[PDB]
Design an enzyme around this catalytic site. Structure first.
Site, mmCIF file in Angstrom:
data_model
loop_
_atom_site.group_PDB
_atom_site.id
_atom_site.type_symbol
_atom_site.label_atom_id
_atom_site.label_comp_id
_atom_site.label_asym_id
_atom_site.label_seq_id
_atom_site.Cartn_x
_atom_site.Cartn_y
_atom_site.Cartn_z
ATOM 1 N N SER A 119 -52.754 70.496 76.779
ATOM 2 C CA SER A 119 -52.990 69.080 76.509
ATOM 3 C C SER A 119 -53.937 68.468 77.534
ATOM 4 O O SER A 119 -54.997 67.940 77.180
ATOM 5 C CB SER A 119 -51.661 68.325 76.479
ATOM 6 O OG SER A 119 -50.851 68.768 75.405
ATOM 7 N N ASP A 183 -54.993 64.795 65.464
ATOM 8 C CA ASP A 183 -54.557 64.892 66.855
ATOM 9 C C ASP A 183 -55.236 63.771 67.628
ATOM 10 O O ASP A 183 -56.430 63.859 67.930
ATOM 11 C CB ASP A 183 -54.895 66.256 67.449
ATOM 12 C CG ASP A 183 -54.208 66.499 68.778
ATOM 13 O OD1 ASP A 183 -52.972 66.674 68.785
ATOM 14 O OD2 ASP A 183 -54.903 66.513 69.816
ATOM 15 N N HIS A 313 -49.976 68.069 67.505
ATOM 16 C CA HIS A 313 -50.215 68.361 68.915
ATOM 17 C C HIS A 313 -49.382 69.550 69.380
ATOM 18 O O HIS A 313 -49.841 70.358 70.196
ATOM 19 C CB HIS A 313 -49.917 67.127 69.766
ATOM 20 C CG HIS A 313 -50.403 67.237 71.178
ATOM 21 N ND1 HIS A 313 -51.734 67.403 71.495
ATOM 22 C CD2 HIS A 313 -49.737 67.209 72.355
ATOM 23 C CE1 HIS A 313 -51.866 67.470 72.808
ATOM 24 N NE2 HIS A 313 -50.669 67.354 73.353
#
Ligand SMILES: Nc1ncnc2c1ncn2[C@@H]1O[C@H](COP(=O)(O)OP(=O)(O)OC[C@H]2O[C@@H](O[C@@H]3[C@H](O)[C@@H](COP(=O)(O)OP(=O)(O)OP(=O)(O)O)O[C@H]3n3cnc4c(N)ncnc43)[C@H](O)[C@@H]2O)[C@@H](O)[C@H]1O
Lengths: 576, 393, 473
Positions: A119, A183, A313
């Protein structure tokens, strides 16, 4: 494929990211002959927006000692990057980080290494890979260390200047960024700090993979997504307008009262569909598509988009495992991109915008080609050849340098010399203006042939320009030449030359024009400096000794009129 | 050294020293001497270092433009040529090339107190009179002479009458060396000579409207140079340039069919041309250049049929061109140089095999319509800077 | 494509600028009462034919103080109004900007469906200037505005079934809004709501025809071609100025100033080089610089800088070197008072721009450099001399003149002598004026013949022959 990566390496990167998913900052995985490194992500709102600075987004200028190559050679301005990511990188790159010993043992092992993150650590991986390229790759051509950076939906960590620098060094091809269709993480940083300052904490909490028991508030998630997409749409419209170039005055007037995040995609990107994977390498096209790939489809879709944005995600495992079966298409390869634009879910707007971006890229490529063709013509090189091997030898035989002969223009050859100088200056400044408006490929300024040509043209013409400037008393009306008289083309050429090999001998005469006439003491130190630099200049060919040390050259007269002690203790005593 | 080249050099030696000469002058001088191949001999002599050539203006020389080529010699060469000519000459009439200079208004000693009829059979006769001398005529006659040149400097000048006695003369050159234009009179003496072919005037005050009334039976080419303004059977070429005060061309030039080439250049005070120009059926070349006051061209240009070349370079104030230029089929070449601000009508589509000479800025005017037109090729020529005008200055 | 307009339309409908302005206008509505509603940063103030502006000038004189204060504060300034309040606000903002400086943040004036009679002359004056960048209008696709005396000024935002599109092509805007005016005016709130709904919509259709975009692209390409063509022709103009430089050098070598040589040649042409210089180079540079000064004045090259130094510094030399020829041509026809009566506009514009720019320079001059290549700063200098000459004649040929005109001419001569002595003391005149056969020596001889016994600094300086060592060292 063209990306230079395969399935097992992507699986190893994903495994390393999952392993480093814990709090441990750096995780090392040595598989075969590759030591992959993964970084820990963060799900706290403070980790994204640094609370110490006052900027509306968290931008900070980079330093020169660390990233010398991350600058615009022409404008000479440093790029801007995120503050929290830079702080995390500097903290994980300290002496006690233990990363230096691992990187040194790896570089000694002569093995492949990659920096990845899921991330946000992956974003830091970028800040690491660039560093890995700014300390070993660029400076150590001995190594075959082509690094590999792989991210999975990492937010933008660079502005336009960052991408320009990454492209000018041929390093953009060393990055890969996989992103799903829904996303919002990469686009989060594109939103205003205040517009989402409140919903940011709950959003980050819900996005936390470890803590998934957060009470997902549909209203707050929807409002945050709406704000982020609205700011993204504003920035995309601004970008498409500035690319169109129409209504510049009104555009600037509107921007004067508006704010937009300066972040821009860096490197190649790859969008993941339900069964196909699309790839894009143009930054502007990627930015334009980031807003349209997730556009609201309908009421039900506009209401279900929050769940998909929250789940995709973490659903990266799906595509990381299904990569074996999928369709690959290079949007730059084919031209009628309508196929992928329809199978992904974008409308005619994004289609036209990406088409316009592609045509702009093609137009800049054609402009570069035309410039190369016009500079490769013999009609152009003939002027330089003449000014080099026809004008200088005659003047030298005349017992005086061409500089003085040009100053006191009393022969017909001076007219032709001035005409050729004016034509060359016009052509070079036209090329400079064409390159200044961002109309040429980034690699153009990095070419070696163009750099050598510009250096030769400068070393050959700049003395003539200085003579023409001082021979008509232009400095009296405009001031010293080194302040508001030097053309911009010479500055860019000098900067490019100084950067390629890693003030200037060309302006030597300029200095000789200032000290002349004034007392010796009030300029002593200055003179000394010259007496040093000029020396090494004679060794670097920047200034030919056969010209300055001539009989009728003003330099010899000025040096002779100096006091006795100066000539006594100066190294230039032998030449006179 | 070829005998022909030696003769051409001894003839060219007729001019005085320290004088900037134009190629057209010497070409018209020795035209009837060795046909229409003077440029070849001139280039051959220049290659041998005997003479120096300087392009003053357009660099194009093979196109026959003899108005941009100055010829300069060395004092030593001129002195040697004069000495050789004097040595070759043994008597008054025996000399084939004799030059006279009656300074201080005093005639030559030989012709000063002559008893018998003074007549010399010299192919080339040159007379130079200073502005102080009254330029009075004397008793004489040229029995065998083809060309005659006159270097005058007085404000007022009257051509002598004995010129009418000549019968073998073919071309006459009147060069004036004075700060102000000279005044010529008694031109009727030239209308009787039926062997004259070319006429040239430079830095003189002449009435153009009186030229046709003079009654020139057989004259081929008329050249003007620095003219002060106030039937033609064999006229074919009319060339006028560097003539101020000429606000409008005359009308007689519109009643001559034999006229083939007509080009007036470097004429500032000329804004409009006589519309009655289409009558020139046998018009092949029309060059209007270096004229600023000229903004529009004759609309009635389609009447011409045998038009091969048309040049309008030099006029930047040209608004447009004839709208029906495509009607002419013989048009093959057109050079529109240094004419940026101007629009070309689509009528050019009706033209093939057209070589258009222009530069980069004017090249776009044709590039905009390149695909539509077929058999049309653009040619961009970059000018060449030099200081030959200073030498001429 | 013209959609780019609608593109920025999106942005101009994304921000709450127009929405907040319309809300404030409705609140004020729901008498020139300029209600200022600037809350924190913006300057939202609603405006409450020429007679209306003349009347409102009373309160505008006082409101100008707050307007300038807000402008200097860098806060966003917005000025709009109703059909008539909008026109009044447009007039007020135009006047303010005409009195305001482009350096500070320029204002923006939005018209909420407010008809305004725009004279064709005013539109042509600011046709392609940055002024229109401050004016924008609201016009719904349904209603039109048909006018003959009035003309469209600024950019127009035309709505549609869903969305809006902004344009600024005068001809295109007129062709679009060419329709007759409709009395019925839809509620601006409904239009804003429809625009917001369209923005929230998925896709939007295009209504602009192909001719509009064709003309827009043609105009843009032609303007870019003019821009780049002037930029490139600057170099050929420098090359042509090199020829004038060499000609002036050659004339100086002859012991005669180039000004008097050119004057004599214009009086009695006797050579080809002079004719070529007067009809080929000068006529081209004059037209080029005229076009430059005329087009750049509308839309400057850069904000806060009327033009780049590359152009201004070159134009300064062009003026200082060419203006003497124009002065000679003007004084050769008999006209007088060139400085005030018959001076061109581009010369004065370039002089003013250079005087305003070079003020920040820190130049310094020495007392030893040679002045053989110097150029007179006061380009009109020669002109003055010519005038004095006339006076001299009026004192020699004229007989039985009144004492009043006599003393007036004497004072004029003494003031000219003082001015020339002052300009010489500062070393701001090339020594070429002291040439033998130059008009300056003739004027000096005339002044000496008319002086008699009076003596001053200039008289002694000329008699002592010191002028020979003026610029030599
Ligand atoms: N007294 C005289 N007596 C007789 N003749 C004269 C006289 N004077 C002139 N002539 C002649 O006038 C002709 C016109 O040339 P001329 O009079 O136009 O002069 P030349 O072009 O031959 O040479 C000028 C010399 O000065 C440098 O050139 C810079 C640079 O080129 C540009 C920066 O701008 P750039 O950086 O390039 O680009 P930008 O994008 O605009 O930068 P930005 O503003 O930050 O955006 O200004 C130029 N520049 C700086 N100072 C001046 C100045 N005082 N005058 C004109 N240009 C200037 C460069 O050393 C060159 O030798 C020349 O042939 C002259 O021979």
């Amino acid at each position: 494929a063209l990306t230079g990566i395969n399935g097992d390496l992507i699986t190893r990167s994903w495994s390393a990211s999952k392993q480093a998913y814990l709090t441990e900052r750096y995780h090392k995985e040595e598989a075969g002959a590759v030591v992959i490194f993964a970084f820990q992500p963060s799900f706290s709102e403070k980790d994204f927006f640094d609370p110490d600075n006052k900027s509306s987004f968290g931008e900070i200028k980079l330093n020169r000692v660390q990233f010398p190559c991350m600058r615009k050679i022409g404008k000479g301005d440093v790029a801007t990057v995120n503050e929290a990511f830079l702080k995390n990188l500097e903290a994980i790159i300290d002496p006690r980080t233990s990363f230096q010993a691992s990187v040194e043992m790896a570089v000694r092992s002569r093995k492949q290494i990659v920096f990845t993150g899921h991330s946000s650590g992956g974003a830091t991986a970028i800040l690491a890979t660039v560093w890995y390229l700014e300390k070993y790759f660029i400076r150590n051509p001995n190594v075959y260390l082509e690094p590999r950076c792989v991210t999975f939906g990492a937010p933008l960590v660079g502005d336009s200047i960052f991408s320009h620098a990454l492209g000018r060094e041929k390093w953009s091809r060393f990055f890969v960024n996989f992103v799903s269709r829904f996303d919002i993480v990469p686009r989060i940083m594109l939103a205003r700090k205040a517009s989402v300052e409140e919903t940011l904490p709950h959003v980050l909490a819900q996005l936390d993979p470890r803590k998934s028991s957060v009470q997902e508030s549909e209203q707050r998630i929807t409002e945050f997504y709406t704000r982020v997409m609205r700011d993204t749409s504003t920035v995309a419209n601004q970008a498409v307008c500035e690319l169109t170039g129409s209504a510049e005055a009104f555009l600037e007037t509107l921007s004067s009262f508006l704010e937009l995040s300066p972040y821009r995609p860096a490197g190649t990107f790859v969008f993941s569909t339900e069964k196909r994977l699309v790839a894009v390498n143009n930054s502007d096209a990627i930015l334009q598509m980031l807003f349209y790939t997730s556009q609201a489809s309908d009421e039900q879709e506009w209401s279900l988009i929050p769940f998909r944005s929250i789940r995709d995600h973490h659903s990266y495992e799906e595509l990381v495992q299904s990569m074996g079966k999928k369709l690959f298409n290079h949007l730059d390869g084919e031209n009628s991109i309508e196929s992928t634009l329809n199978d992904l879910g974008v409308s005619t707007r994004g289609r036209q915008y990406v088409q316009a971006a592609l045509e702009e890229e093609k137009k800049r490529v054609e402009n570069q080609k035309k410039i190369i063709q016009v500079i490769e013509q013999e009609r152009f090189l003939k002027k330089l050849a003449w000014i080099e091997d026809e004008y200088k030898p005659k003047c030298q035989a005349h017992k005086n340098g061409y500089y003085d002969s040009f100053k006191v223009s009393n022969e017909e050859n001076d007219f032709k010399a001035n005409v050729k100088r004016a034509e060359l200056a016009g052509v070079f400044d036209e090329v400079l203006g064409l390159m200044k408006k961002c109309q040429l490929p980034d690699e153009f300024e990095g070419d070696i042939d163009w750099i050598k040509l510009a250096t030769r043209y400068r070393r050959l013409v700049e003395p003539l320009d200085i003579a023409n400037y001082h021979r008509h008393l232009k400095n009296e009306d405009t001031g010293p030449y080194m302040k508001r008289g030097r053309p911009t083309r010479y500055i860019y050429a000098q900067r490019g030359y100084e950067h390629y090999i890693l003030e200037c001998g060309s302006c030597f005469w300029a200095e000789v024009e200032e000290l002349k006439g004034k007392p010796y003491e009030e300029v002593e130190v200055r003179v000394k400096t010259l007496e040093g630099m000029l020396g090494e200049w004679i060794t670097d060919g920047e200034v030919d000794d056969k010209e300055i040390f001539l009989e009728g050259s003003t330099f010899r007269k000025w040096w002779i009129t100096l006091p006795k002690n100066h000539k006594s203790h100066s190294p230039l005593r032998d030449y006179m | 050294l070829p005998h022909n080249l030696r003769e051409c050099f001894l003839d060219m030696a007729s001019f005085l020293e320290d004088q900037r000469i134009i190629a057209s002058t010497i070409i018209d001088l020795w035209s009837a001497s060795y046909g229409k191949e003077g440029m070849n001999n001139l280039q051959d002599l220049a290659s041998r270092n005997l003479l120096k050539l300087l392009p003053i203006g357009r660099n194009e020389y093979e196109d026959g433009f003899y108005n941009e080529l100055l010829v300069k010699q060395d004092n030593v060469l001129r002195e040697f040529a004069i000495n050789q000519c004097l040595k070759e000459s043994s008597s008054i009439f025996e000399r084939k090339r004799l030059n006279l200079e009656i300074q201080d208004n005093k005639f030559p000693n030989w012709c000063l107190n002559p008893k018998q009829p003074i007549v010399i059979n010299a192919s080339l006769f040159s007379i130079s009179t200073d502005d102080s001398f009254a330029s009075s005529w004397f008793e004489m006659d040229c029995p065998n002479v083809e060309a005659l040149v006159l270097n005058i400097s007085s404000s007022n000048y009257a051509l002598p009458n004995f010129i009418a006695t000549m019968k073998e003369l073919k071309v006459v050159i009147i060069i004036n060396h004075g700060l102000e234009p000279a005044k010529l009179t008694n031109l009727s003496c030239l209308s009787s000579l039926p062997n004259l072919k070319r006429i040239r005037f430079e830095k003189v005050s002449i009435s153009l409207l009186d030229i046709p009334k003079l009654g020139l039976k057989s004259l081929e080419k008329l050249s003007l140079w620095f003219c002060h303004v106030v039937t033609l059977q064999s006229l074919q070429e009319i060339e006028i340039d560097y003539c101020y005060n000429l606000d409008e061309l005359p009308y007689w030039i519109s009643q001559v069919v034999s006229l083939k080439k007509l080009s007036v250049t470097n004429c500032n005070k000329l804004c409009r041309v006589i519309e009655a120009i289409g009558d020139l059926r046998d018009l092949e070349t029309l060059r209007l250049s270096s004229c600023a006051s000229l903004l529009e061209l004759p609309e009635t240009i389609d009447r011409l049929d045998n038009l091969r070349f048309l040049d309008v370079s030099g006029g930047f104030q040209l608004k447009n061109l004839p709208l029906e230029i495509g009607k002419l089929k013989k048009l093959e070449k057109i050079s529109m140089k240094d004419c940026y601000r101007c629009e070309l009508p689509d009528s050019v589509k009706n033209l093939e095999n057209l070589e258009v000479k222009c530069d980069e800025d004017t090249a776009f005017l044709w590039k905009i319509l390149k695909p539509e037109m077929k058999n049309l090729t653009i040619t961009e020529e970059k000018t060449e800077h030099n200081l030959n005008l200073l030498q001429l200055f | 494509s013209s959609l780019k307009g609608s593109a920025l339309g999106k942005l101009v409908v994304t921000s709450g600028l127009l929405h907040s302005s319309w809300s404030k206008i409705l609140e004020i509505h729901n008498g020139l009462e300029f209600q200022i509603h600037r809350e924190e940063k913006f300057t939202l103030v609603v405006f409450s034919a020429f007679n209306l502006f003349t009347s409102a000038s009373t309160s505008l004189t006082y409101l100008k103080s707050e307007l300038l204060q807000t402008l200097k504060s860098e806060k966003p300034v917005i000025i709009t109004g109703a059909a008539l309040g909008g026109s009044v606000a447009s007039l007020y903002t135009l006047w303010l900007l005409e009195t305001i400086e482009p350096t500070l943040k320029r204002p923006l004036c939005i018209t909420f469906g407010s008809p305004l009679i725009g004279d064709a002359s005013l539109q042509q004056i600011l046709e392609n200037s940055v002024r229109n960048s401050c004016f924008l209008h609201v016009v719904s696709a349904q209603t039109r505005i048909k006018m003959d005396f009035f003309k469209p000024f600024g950019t127009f935002l035309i709505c549609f079934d869903s969305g809006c599109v902004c344009i600024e092509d005068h001809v295109a805007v007129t062709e679009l809004l060419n329709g007759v005016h409709d009395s019925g005016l839809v509620d601006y709130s409904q239009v804003l709501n429809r625009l917001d709904q369209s923005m929230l919509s998925l896709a939007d259709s295009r209504l602009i025809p192909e001719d509009v975009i064709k003309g827009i692209e043609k105009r843009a390409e032609m303007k870019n071609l003019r821009f780049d063509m002037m930029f490139k022709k600057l170099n050929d103009m420098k090359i042509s100025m090199a020829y004038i430089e060499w000609y002036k050098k050659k004339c100086k070598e002859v012991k005669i100033g180039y000004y008097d040589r050119f004057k004599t040649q214009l009086a009695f042409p006797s050579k080809e080089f002079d004719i070529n210089i007067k009809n080929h180079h000068k006529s081209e540079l004059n037209r080029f610089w005229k076009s430059v000064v005329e087009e750049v004045e509308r839309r400057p090259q850069s904000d806060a800088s009327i033009l780049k130094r590359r152009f201004l510094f070159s134009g300064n030399n062009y003026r200082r070197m060419i203006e003497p020829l124009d002065i000679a041509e003007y004084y050769l026809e008999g006209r007088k008072e060139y400085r005030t009566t018959g001076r061109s506009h581009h010369y004065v514009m370039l002089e003013k721009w250079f005087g305003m720019e070079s003020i920040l320079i820190e130049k310094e001059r020495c007392k030893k450099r040679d002045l053989s290549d110097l150029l007179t700063f006061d380009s009109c200098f020669w002109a003055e001399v010519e005038d004095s000459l006339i006076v001299i004649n009026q004192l020699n040929t004229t007989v039985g003149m009144r004492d009043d005109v006599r003393e007036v001419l004497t004072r004029k001569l003494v003031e000219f002598e003082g001015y020339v002595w002052e300009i010489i003391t500062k070393r701001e005149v090339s020594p070429e004026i002291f040439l033998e056969e130059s008009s300056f020596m003739k004027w000096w001889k005339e002044y000496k013949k008319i002086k008699g016994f009076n003596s001053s600094y200039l008289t002694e300086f000329m008699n002592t022959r010191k002028y020979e060592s003026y610029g030599k060292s």
